[PDB]
Every structure is written in C-alpha cells, then in structure tokens.
Design an enzyme around this catalytic site. Sequence first.
Site, PDB file in Angstrom:
ATOM      1  N   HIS A 119       0.768  -1.375   0.041  1.00 16.05           N
ATOM      2  CA  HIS A 119       0.023   0.003   0.041  1.00 16.05           C
ATOM      3  C   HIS A 119       0.833   1.438   0.327  1.00 16.05           C
ATOM      4  O   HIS A 119       0.214   2.444   0.037  1.00 16.05           O
ATOM      5  CB  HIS A 119      -1.025   0.022   1.189  1.00 16.05           C
ATOM      6  CG  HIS A 119      -0.281  -0.034   2.461  1.00 16.05           C
ATOM      7  ND1 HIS A 119      -0.015   1.279   3.038  1.00 16.05           N
ATOM      8  CD2 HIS A 119       0.102  -0.801   3.382  1.00 16.05           C
ATOM      9  CE1 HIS A 119       0.527   1.144   4.312  1.00 16.05           C
ATOM     10  NE2 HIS A 119       0.598  -0.190   4.506  1.00 16.05           N
ATOM     11  N   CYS A 169       4.405   1.533   9.140  1.00 15.15           N
ATOM     12  CA  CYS A 169       4.400   0.479   8.072  1.00 15.15           C
ATOM     13  C   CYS A 169       5.812   0.254   7.599  1.00 15.15           C
ATOM     14  O   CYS A 169       6.454   1.133   7.329  1.00 15.15           O
ATOM     15  CB  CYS A 169       3.242   0.757   7.180  1.00 15.15           C
ATOM     16  SG  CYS A 169       1.633   0.220   8.025  1.00 15.15           S
ATOM     17  N   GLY A 205       2.897   6.025   9.579  1.00 20.07           N
ATOM     18  CA  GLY A 205       4.234   5.795   8.972  1.00 20.07           C
ATOM     19  C   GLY A 205       5.216   4.674   9.468  1.00 20.07           C
ATOM     20  O   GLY A 205       6.154   4.559   8.955  1.00 20.07           O
TER      21      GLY A 205
HETATM   22  C1  LIG Z   1       1.442   2.299   8.011  1.00 16.79           C
HETATM   23  N1  LIG Z   1       2.220   3.315   8.007  1.00 16.79           N
HETATM   24  C2  LIG Z   1      -0.047   2.506   8.767  1.00 16.79           C
HETATM   25  C3  LIG Z   1       0.173   2.067  10.224  1.00 16.79           C
HETATM   26  C4  LIG Z   1      -1.231   2.201  11.046  1.00 16.79           C
HETATM   27  C5  LIG Z   1      -1.280   3.683  11.171  1.00 16.79           C
HETATM   28  C6  LIG Z   1      -1.919   4.036  12.749  1.00 16.79           C
HETATM   29  N2  LIG Z   1      -1.425   2.772  13.622  1.00 16.79           N
HETATM   30  C7  LIG Z   1      -0.844   1.925  12.745  1.00 16.79           C
HETATM   31  O1  LIG Z   1      -0.366   0.691  12.953  1.00 16.79           O
HETATM   32  N3  LIG Z   1      -1.102   1.317   8.308  1.00 16.79           N
HETATM   33  C8  LIG Z   1      -2.490   1.771   7.851  1.00 16.79           C
HETATM   34  O2  LIG Z   1      -2.875   2.881   8.269  1.00 16.79           O
HETATM   35  C9  LIG Z   1      -3.268   1.019   7.261  1.00 16.79           C
HETATM   36  C10 LIG Z   1      -3.340   0.909   5.755  1.00 16.79           C
HETATM   37  C11 LIG Z   1      -4.550   1.209   5.275  1.00 16.79           C
HETATM   38  C12 LIG Z   1      -5.280   1.958   6.581  1.00 16.79           C
HETATM   39  N4  LIG Z   1      -4.561   1.328   7.671  1.00 16.79           N
HETATM   40  C13 LIG Z   1      -4.986   1.074   9.205  1.00 16.79           C
HETATM   41  O3  LIG Z   1      -4.291   0.553   9.991  1.00 16.79           O
HETATM   42  C14 LIG Z   1      -6.346   1.482   9.402  1.00 16.79           C
HETATM   43  N5  LIG Z   1      -6.895   0.113   9.955  1.00 16.79           N
HETATM   44  C15 LIG Z   1      -7.891  -0.375   9.508  1.00 16.79           C
HETATM   45  O4  LIG Z   1      -8.394   0.255   8.432  1.00 16.79           O
HETATM   46  C16 LIG Z   1      -8.588  -1.756   9.726  1.00 16.79           C
HETATM   47  F1  LIG Z   1      -9.718  -1.421  10.735  1.00 16.79           F
HETATM   48  F2  LIG Z   1      -8.943  -2.340   8.879  1.00 16.79           F
HETATM   49  F3  LIG Z   1      -7.684  -2.437  10.664  1.00 16.79           F
HETATM   50  C17 LIG Z   1      -6.478   2.622  10.463  1.00 16.79           C
HETATM   51  C18 LIG Z   1      -7.747   2.944  10.607  1.00 16.79           C
HETATM   52  C19 LIG Z   1      -5.732   3.956   9.673  1.00 16.79           C
HETATM   53  C20 LIG Z   1      -5.649   2.297  11.638  1.00 16.79           C
HETATM   54  C21 LIG Z   1      -4.192   0.096   4.858  1.00 16.79           C
HETATM   55  C22 LIG Z   1      -3.715  -0.063   3.414  1.00 16.79           C
HETATM   56  C23 LIG Z   1      -5.026  -1.235   5.257  1.00 16.79           C
END
Ligand SMILES: *C(=N)[C@H](C[C@@H]1CCNC1=O)NC(=O)[C@@H]1[C@@H]2[C@H](CN1C(=O)[C@@H](NC(=O)C(F)(F)F)C(C)(C)C)C2(C)C
Lengths: 306, 306
Positions: free
Chosen positions: B41, B145, B143
């Site tokens: 992503h 990820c 950030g």
């Molecule tokens: C990568 N940098 C981030 C790390 C996240 C951000 C906040 N805490 C973390 O661990 N990854 C994401 O933001 C991923 C990514 C889209 C949205 N996302 C989420 O983690 C979201 N979670 C969900 O949508 C759910 F419910 F499915 F787990 C969020 C609401 C922003 C926490 C993709 C491509 C899955």
Amino acid sequence: SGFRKMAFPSGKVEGCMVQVTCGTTTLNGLWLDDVVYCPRHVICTSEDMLNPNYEDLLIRKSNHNFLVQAGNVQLRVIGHSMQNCVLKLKVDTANPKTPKYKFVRIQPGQTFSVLACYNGSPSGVYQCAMRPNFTIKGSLLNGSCGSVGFNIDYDCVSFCYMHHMELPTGVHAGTDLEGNFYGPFVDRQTAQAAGTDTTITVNVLAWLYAAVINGDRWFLNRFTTTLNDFNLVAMKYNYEPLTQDHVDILGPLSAQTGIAVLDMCASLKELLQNGMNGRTILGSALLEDEFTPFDVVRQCSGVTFQ
Amino acid sequence: SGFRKMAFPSGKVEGCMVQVTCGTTTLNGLWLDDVVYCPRHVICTSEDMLNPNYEDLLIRKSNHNFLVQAGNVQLRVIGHSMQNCVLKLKVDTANPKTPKYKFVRIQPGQTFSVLACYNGSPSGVYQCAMRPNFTIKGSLLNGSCGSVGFNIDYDCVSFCYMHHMELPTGVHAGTDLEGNFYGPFVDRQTAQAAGTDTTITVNVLAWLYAAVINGDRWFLNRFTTTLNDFNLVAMKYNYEPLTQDHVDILGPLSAQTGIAVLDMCASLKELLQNGMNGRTILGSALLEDEFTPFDVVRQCSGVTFQ
Ligand SMILES: *C(=N)[C@H](C[C@@H]1CCNC1=O)NC(=O)[C@@H]1[C@@H]2[C@H](CN1C(=O)[C@@H](NC(=O)C(F)(F)F)C(C)(C)C)C2(C)C
Ligand SMILES: *C(=N)[C@H](C[C@@H]1CCNC1=O)NC(=O)[C@@H]1[C@@H]2[C@H](CN1C(=O)[C@@H](NC(=O)C(F)(F)F)C(C)(C)C)C2(C)C
C-alpha cells in the site's frame, strides 16, 4: 496506538562493546575513540574482591596484562589509568564505529536503555529507571559488568551508567562513566543494601497521560487539588514529592491531552486511595513509574534517531 | 538475577532500514542485498486505500516512480514486483550492511522484537508475541508500516513480521516477509476486527519457571495433576491448550529448577482458580504470557549474539 516499555535502538552502542580480560577475570568494556572503559574490579581475583585495595592491585599491572578483544581483533594496550571505580585503557587503534557521544550523570527517576553484554557481545536491550534509592531493576548476570546504560538524542549517545554489582533483592548498582557510583555503594563484596525504594510520582503521571493519549480514560475524575493536598497524600503512600519543576515538565502532555496537571493529580489521588478495583491501565494491573514525560512524548509522537 | 521484557539488540536490523516514497505516500523498507521490501500500500493514495486494486495500481508505476532513501543516498530502482501484500524493489546497489538472514513465518505464541521506524529511521525496539488471534500488541503509529519483527540466532537475523495496519482496540496486524498476512486480515481500510484473544499457556508456565529461577516461589504448591485435569480448567479461563510438545519444550527449564512440568501446571491451576491475592510474580500483578521457554533460557543463561 499502543504503549510499550521501549528501548533505544542499540546499534550505536553495540559497535562500542569489547571484552576485557585481566588474568582470570573477564568483563565488558566500552571502546570509544582510542580508550576502553571498564569496571576496575577486572583487576581482582575472586579473593581480592572481598576486600580489595585497587591502587595496590593496579600498581602490579602493566599494559600487556590487559587483553582487549574487539571481535576477532586484539587491541594493543598502550596506557592505563584509574578514575574512581572505572579503569581506562588507552589502545593504539581508534574505534572506527565510535558515535558522537557524551558522558552524563542522570538524576533519580530518569530512564535509560541497558545493553546487557557477556564477553563483549550483546544479549539484549531493555529500558530502566534510576530508582530514587539509586538502584536499577535490571536483568543482569555474572559477567555483565561493563554493560552500559544510555540515551540517544538525534545522533548522539549519552552514556549514563556502567554496571558493577548486584545487591540484595536482585537489584543493581553501578557508576557513571567517570567511575562515580550512583548511591552510597562501593565496589567490594561485603554486605550492603539499598535504601527503601519509592515511587517516582512525575513518572506515574506521565504514564497516566500516555494512557489518555491511547484512550485509557476510566480513571479520570471530575476533581482538582492543590499541590499540597496531593503531596500530603503521596507521602503516606511512599510517593516521591511532586515539584513545580515537575509540573512545568508535564506541560506539553497537559496541553496535548487537555488535562491540567492538577486534574491528573486529583485522578491519581483517588487511584491510590481507592485502589484500581481489578482494572488495568494500559494493560498493567499496577501504576507504572518507569516512563519519564519525555519517554511518553518520544514514544507517542514517533521520535527517531540517526 | 532479575527478569525483564528484553529485546534483541537491533543494530543488524537498523543497517537494513530505508525510506520508500511513492508519490505522497512514505513508509519504511527493508534493504537486504540488492532488494528493498515494503508493504504494497505504499503505491496507494489515501483514497485508494478504502478499496484498492493493487495489481491495477502497480501497472501504472515504473521504476523511477519509487524514491528509496538510505540515509542521504538515493538508491536507483531497477526492478519491481509484487508478492502477496509486499512490494519488492530491486536496486543497483547491494546493501553492504546486509547481515546473514532468513525469512521465517512464526507460530502463535512465538515472540520477536519489533524495530519501530518512521521515515526509514529507528524509534525504538521492544519484544512482542504473535497472539493466538494473529495480532501483536504493538506500539506503532502513522508511518510505521514497513517496520519488521525479527529474532537473532547467533549471527543470523530471522525476519518474521512486516507491519501493515492497526485494528480496533489498538492491536496490530501484518505479514511475513513473503507478503502473507498473519490471520485473516487484508491490507484495506474497511471494518475488520481480531478474533477474541487467548492466553498462551506454555508461555505462562515458562514465565513461572523464570520466577522460580529468580527466587519468586510463593505460588508453588504441593500438588500434581494430569494434563487433562489442567487443560479442562484452562479452557474455562480462556487459556490455550497445553500439548505434550509443549511439555517436551518445557523440559530444559523443568530439569534446571527441579520442578516437573505437571507440578508447575498444578501450581498454575490453583493460581487461576484462587487469583493472585494481591501479590506479584516477578514484580507483575498479572500472569505474563509473552515469554517463550527459549526466551527465558536465553535471558537467564546470558545468551549473546555476534
Ligand atoms: C502504516 N504506516 C500504517 C500504520 C497504522 C497507522 C496507525 N497505527 C498503525 O499501525 N498502516 C495503515 O494505516 C493501514 C493501511 C490502510 C489503513 N491502515 C490502518 O491501519 C487502518 N486500520 C483499518 O482500516 C482496519 F480497521 F482495517 F484495521 C487505520 C484506521 C488507519 C488504523 C491500509 C492500506 C490497510
Ligand atoms: C560483574 N560482572 C558482576 C555482575 C553481578 C554478578 C551477578 N549479578 C550481577 O549483577 N559484578 C559482581 O559480581 C560484583 C563485584 C564483586 C562482587 N559483586 C556482586 O555483585 C556481589 N554483590 C555484593 O557483594 C553486594 F552485596 F555488595 F552487592 C554478588 C554477591 C556476587 C551479587 C564486586 C567487585 C563488588
């Protein structure tokens, strides 16, 4: 989201660890530039350690008596001195992995990471607080002396602790990097004990701000209190006094979460009095006092190091 | 003596972290040899992430569209592919700090260290367990990820986790280094939730052996029990079943401390039933299930890494 007891990334300090052998005794050294620092009881046999005369033991030693091993390289020792309870060994090679660094002496309640080493090699890293009684609740074994505690500021390693001994109840004592002990201990195997420990109040509050930041908010009540009403209660529960300097330091977290420092004190006042009633704050069943305010801010806002 | 939640020394993994930018989106990559691995992503805008077609998004991208930064060096991208939920970028420079490494997929209950990074730089390291519901209780932010989880065996880094997302209740989900998610999650911003979690029983027992090794022994009773009598009680308290493989694995600690695995099960049986009665084991007011037997042995016997 989420809150963990986080350690500093250890790579900078790993590049500095060496093994120092004198006769039968081996422990860890810190190699910075062209000097290796280690605890001075490396020059003791097991028997010397019951009642050592370090100056006497050190007269008998010349440079070639110190075996310093950095990986599979022996460093040639070309000088040696003693500075309080640390030995400094000058070597003819500057450590090319020496980071930018400083030597600091920390205050009770401040935190650091310990890189636990055996034979000059790292076993693990964990976060520790200098306890108000000048011990640390470590996990350290025979051979771990010379392991160091540190903070990182951007690209700079601040070394604050060198490990020397374990005390009754399984807690640990050591020196700053000038060989000066934290607390009234001496590097000698004779009966010693830490003073009675006490809870670091500014850290508990900082931990409560972290809980709020992460959505743990059940312990928030609708009360205030003056610094006097709270500190009076805290003394009885063996909590360190909270100063206005502490309040000023808690400022950024107070402004972030919208909770005045005194309102958090009101909430904590109740918690101590009424107990947690079988609930957990940030998944812990006990008030946690080993996060400084800056540790919470660094953890919760993603601060990195170079 | 002493027992801490210990992380692996992170230096080997630090040398592998880079920043990967595609358009507006930036996250962390793992640079090993001449390949950079990161979550796929990175090729999504914020809007794409609600319902992405990754294959479609990736057709539109050429090599020069990926900005890879290693310190103050931009790595030239010369190839790209997608393998499940990870993107692999080939670069024209092999990372000279690449350690010996393997890719592994771990089992529930196994532990690892996470090196939390932002913009390709480390913020901290902490120990984590793969939960039985295939989440991890991390501390990870926007950030983060591309941060990875790992073990060290002597001089070898086993990478087991790459971070992708946060789920409700503030827990985290990711993939192995082949892009395959732990658990039934997908990399898409739509409502998802972890299954109900459960306590890792072999780990609680390993933690109880660590307490015994460190002199915490008040919870020891004079009873045995068969694996059936215990596992029956454990099911009710939402404890993972204890297998004979687990018993075999607990062997070394059983022989070290002189307590048969079934006697420890008897002691734990009581603990669950009767509660801890306001006492603490190794300074925790809660049974701890995030130490594997090998974590205890590695911590308590001083195992190091090269
Ligand atoms: C990568 N940098 C981030 C790390 C996240 C951000 C906040 N805490 C973390 O661990 N990854 C994401 O933001 C991923 C990514 C889209 C949205 N996302 C989420 O983690 C979201 N979670 C969900 O949508 C759910 F419910 F499915 F787990 C969020 C609401 C922003 C926490 C993709 C491509 C899955
Ligand atoms: C350095 N490698 C060791 C680390 C110790 C060993 C077990 N856990 C640790 O942290 N340092 C020592 O063994 C120091 C050292 C002599 C003896 N010592 C102790 O830590 C002893 N403690 C004490 O004598 C007391 F009570 F004063 F704290 C021991 C009983 C072995 C734990 C010297 C030179 C002080």
